[PDB]
Design a protein around this nucleic acid. Sequence first.
DNA 1: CGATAAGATATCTTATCG
DNA 2: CGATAAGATATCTTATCG
Lengths: 62, 62
Amino acid sequence: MKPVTLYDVAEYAGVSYQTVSRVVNQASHVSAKTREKVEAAMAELNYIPNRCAQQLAGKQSL
Amino acid sequence: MKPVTLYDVAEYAGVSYQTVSRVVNQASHVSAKTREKVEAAMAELNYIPNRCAQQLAGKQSL
DNA sequence: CGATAAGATATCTTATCG
DNA sequence: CGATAAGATATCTTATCG
């Protein structure tokens, strides 16, 4: 079950992954609008606490 | 400083990485003793990934 | 069936530019 | 100081062989 990736929030926010990922990791070096955009994005997409693979993994393409 | 990796468990179990890696994710087509050693290995070595961002800060210095 | 190797994707880290 | 781009590493999944 992989609903959202930090990439998803990033895209939805309109910012690089580590734009928002940096935000999610502390965001000690960013701007106002950015945090609010990522915050909005993750909020809308719900964004579960599993960007990488803490207690749930799996990935495929093509 | 870097804790266990699936490679560590793999080596310690005496099985290729891809063997135990698939084990930890399903282990559909795997023998008995194999599961025992992978499980043992990860158990003995404790096995803590930390491939995200918990306490493992310094990783690669480029 | 069980084990090994290769390919693809995501996350994080570091460096550069405005 | 802040955002973007490139590179490296690890994990996961699928296919083939004995």
